Structures are given as structure tokens and as C-alpha cells.
């Protein structure tokens, strides 16, 4: 039940990396 | 909601034929200060397709607001992996969590993340989650 919040953490990470030009368009979830 | 004239400006600058892809919608949403998940992207594509006019872009940005986000839910997600209850996680532990579970970070993403935001082999995940929600 922690996975949904890991995803939120990862989404906020990606929000802060938006200027870094690193994030893919698609991710294979786990 | 985000700042409306910024939303309009960024959409118009990214648009081609008055539309943006959901892939670009993801980027613009982040630039606007939101944290859409890839699940949000897939959900919206199944609902409204992968090419958005401004009205549909506004709606996508809407589904990406996640007002339910709360520091305690994030902190405790990391705490679950804090096996020995140290109050911190090692770079290894952070890497394994973030690149294995959920919507895993690529090594590109993780390496960038670690460069700016990580400081050692004792990552205070409370303070890290605070920073990420900021």
C-alpha cells in the first residue's frame, strides 16, 4: 500500500527535474 | 489550480496546430508546478486521446493537481524500507526504492536527482520528501 505514495514521490522528483531534460515520455510501472 | 495565464502561455508556445501531445502536457504540467504521474497520463489518454486542444489540456492539468499529497504519506512510504529504523536511508537504499518500485526512475533521472538533492550515505528522507513537495 506504499507504492501509490512512492509514485507520488517519483512524480514530485520528476517535477523538480523538469529543466534537466532527463525524464522519459513513458515508464514501465512496477 | 495553477496560474492561468502561465498555463495559456506555455500551451500556446508548445502547441502545433493548436494542440499538444499528452507527452508535452506532462512536461508543461511540471513546469506549471504540478506532479502528474505516468498513470495520470495513461488514464487521460484512455479518456481523451493523446492530442489535446487547450480545453483538454486544462482538464489534464486539473487531474494532475493531487491535492491529497501529504508529507506524512510520503515520509512513511520511505520509512517502510527503513528496516533498522535509522531515520535515514543510504544511497543504495534510496536508489533501490526509486529505481525498482512504483514508476521507476531511469539511471539518468536518478543520477541527476542524486547529484543535486542527495548529500551522503545518510539521506534524511523526511527532509528529502519536504524538498520534493516544495
From TrEMBL, chain B:
<keyword id="KW-0677">Repeat</keyword>
<dbReference type="GO" id="GO:0016460">
    <property type="term" value="C:myosin II complex"/>
</dbReference>
<keyword id="KW-0479">Metal-binding</keyword>
<dbReference type="GO" id="GO:0005509">
    <property type="term" value="F:calcium ion binding"/>
</dbReference>
<keyword id="KW-0007">Acetylation</keyword>
<protein>
    <recommendedName>
        <fullName>Calmodulin</fullName>
    </recommendedName>
</protein>
<feature type="domain" description="EF-hand">
    <location>
        <begin position="69"/>
        <end position="104"/>
    </location>
</feature>
